[PDB]
Write an enzyme that holds these catalytic residues in place. Structure first.
Site, PDB file in Angstrom:
ATOM      1  N   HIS A 148     -81.716 -39.366 -33.819  1.00  0.00           N
ATOM      2  CA  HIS A 148     -81.775 -38.309 -34.815  1.00  0.00           C
ATOM      3  C   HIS A 148     -82.299 -38.914 -36.125  1.00  0.00           C
ATOM      4  O   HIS A 148     -82.255 -40.127 -36.327  1.00  0.00           O
ATOM      5  CB  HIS A 148     -80.383 -37.719 -35.063  1.00  0.00           C
ATOM      6  CG  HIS A 148     -79.837 -36.904 -33.925  1.00  0.00           C
ATOM      7  ND1 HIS A 148     -80.392 -35.707 -33.529  1.00  0.00           N
ATOM      8  CD2 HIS A 148     -78.756 -37.096 -33.132  1.00  0.00           C
ATOM      9  CE1 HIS A 148     -79.693 -35.211 -32.523  1.00  0.00           C
ATOM     10  NE2 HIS A 148     -78.691 -36.033 -32.267  1.00  0.00           N
ATOM     11  N   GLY A 149     -82.780 -38.076 -37.027  1.00  0.00           N
ATOM     12  CA  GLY A 149     -83.139 -38.580 -38.333  1.00  0.00           C
ATOM     13  C   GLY A 149     -83.401 -37.552 -39.394  1.00  0.00           C
ATOM     14  O   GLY A 149     -83.344 -36.350 -39.146  1.00  0.00           O
ATOM     15  N   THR A 209     -75.325 -33.947 -31.983  1.00  0.00           N
ATOM     16  CA  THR A 209     -75.394 -33.659 -30.554  1.00  0.00           C
ATOM     17  C   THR A 209     -75.970 -34.847 -29.788  1.00  0.00           C
ATOM     18  O   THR A 209     -76.555 -35.760 -30.383  1.00  0.00           O
ATOM     19  CB  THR A 209     -76.226 -32.378 -30.266  1.00  0.00           C
ATOM     20  OG1 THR A 209     -77.534 -32.506 -30.845  1.00  0.00           O
ATOM     21  CG2 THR A 209     -75.627 -31.156 -30.962  1.00  0.00           C
ATOM     22  N   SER A 210     -75.782 -34.835 -28.471  1.00  0.00           N
ATOM     23  CA  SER A 210     -76.346 -35.862 -27.614  1.00  0.00           C
ATOM     24  C   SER A 210     -77.830 -35.580 -27.434  1.00  0.00           C
ATOM     25  O   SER A 210     -78.251 -34.426 -27.373  1.00  0.00           O
ATOM     26  CB  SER A 210     -75.633 -35.906 -26.259  1.00  0.00           C
ATOM     27  OG  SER A 210     -76.181 -34.947 -25.373  1.00  0.00           O
TER      28      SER A 210
END
Ligand SMILES: O=C(CCC(=O)Nc1ccc2c(c1)C(=O)C(=O)NC2=O)Nc1cccc(OCCF)c1
Lengths: 233, 235
Positions: free
Chosen positions: B88-89, B29-30
């Protein structure tokens, strides 16, 4: 406030798990000189007014049970909690005499929701054990349940952890020396930073074989504390 | 000398990697609210006299390239080095727009033996990214030196945990980091700043969700220090 309340009637428990001899079916070697670390720690934390309990040669099941029991004591009158682990290790794990234990398993016992009498109090885990097999070659020249933990590791993730059979491990010998000299002057994080410097600059391995020669070590401070920690006032 | 020399001609670079939009093939997702973080960081670190360089929506290859390039610069006249990663991660990983990058791979470019002009100087990595999917339910009260030395990794959450972002204000961790650097960079040692960051995130923040699964969740950052000295931003 900015600083943990350390004026409770008691400082707290300091449990030292010292594993030297390992079972035959493990293939694990004996950690010669570990008693030097254990004794050095016992005296250091007694001088900090901790109630110190020493354990020796515990199994993985015994380690689990010791922490479970200790987590179930009533810590209401104690300022903090300290557990020191002296053993072989792997990333995220410490060794009982007869097999591994995930570190998370034993510290989960003390999570803010599982040991209520320590909620909001500093929970310190000092870990003298390997985190892998890597060697450092060196170079020239409402609150969260996971809060109020600190993990003082002897090495960085992935790295081997050096000990001297006579003098003590690099990390604990430095930790004790620094707590002895500064526990009355500096905040804990700054003590631990002195520990890093001392381990980083003063120690260097010696071997007749180049593979293990002139290697270095930096300890690794892992803090989720929300306040400053002074062992006085 | 219990503290790093911070009076080199330059404080140093502060590279900000700000990943908002991810390729369709990932299904990521953004990251709404990330530009707030990136803008806050830019102003905060300029105030600290760091040379900020913002980079947006980099691929895994581009991240690596940027880190490689910067590590090969000459940091002789610089006191330190800062790198902020917003994306993200997972445990040990940050995402480029197209996929995963191991954190170790990026921070290895600066190891004391691969970046000589940063040897003996603090290397600071500020990581705003998930380290897994666990959620914290909270609880009620209401010579030679090692090559791995002089690194500090300031993580937004504990190992294994989700990292909370708010669309309006940015991430809980970056918001809180900027506020405390603004309030205390002139007085406190850096570890003490991050400890206040820890308390701020831990006490003042709680998630809100129409999904009870994601509602009332708590967060604690994670300070990982292999620093050998005290860090003060003001001389
Ligand atoms: O064994 C150790 C610490 C060192 C030890 O007790 N024996 C050891 C075995 C191999 C090596 C070394 C130690 C080194 O120091 C070494 O430099 N190279 C090795 O191959 N850690 C370890 C061992 C096996 C696996 C591991 O990680 C796997 C989990 F991801 C970590």
């Amino acid at each position: 406030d900015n600083s943990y309340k350390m004026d409770y009637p008691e400082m707290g428990l300091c449990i030292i798990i010292n594993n030297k001899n390992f079972h035959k079916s493990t293939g694990m070697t004996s950690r010669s000189g570990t008693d030097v670390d254990a004794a050095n720690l016992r005296e250091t934390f007694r001088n900090l007014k901790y109630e110190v309990r020493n354990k020796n040669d515990l199994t993985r099941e015994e380690i689990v049970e010791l922490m479970r029991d200790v987590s179930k004591e009533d810590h209401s009158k104690r300022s903090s909690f300290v557990c020191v682990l002296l053993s072989h290790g792997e990333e995220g794990i410490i060794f009982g005499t007869n097999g591994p234990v995930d570190l998370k398993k034993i510290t989960n016992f003390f999570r803010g929701d599982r040991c209520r009498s320590l909620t909001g109090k500093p929970k310190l885990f000092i870990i003298q054990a390997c985190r892998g097999t890597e060697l450092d070659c060196g170079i020239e020249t409402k609150i969260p349940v996971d809060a109020d933990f600190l993990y003082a590791y002897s090495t960085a993730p992935g790295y081997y952890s050096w000990r001297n059979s006579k003098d003590g491990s690099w990390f604990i010998q430095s930790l004790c020396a620094m707590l002895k000299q500064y526990a009355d002057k500096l905040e804990f994080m700054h003590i631990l930073t002195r520990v890093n410097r001392k381990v980083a600059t003063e120690f260097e391995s010696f071997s007749f074989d180049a593979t293990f020669h002139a290697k270095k070590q930096i300890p690794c401070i892992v803090s989720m504390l929300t306040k400053e920690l002074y062992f006085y006032h």
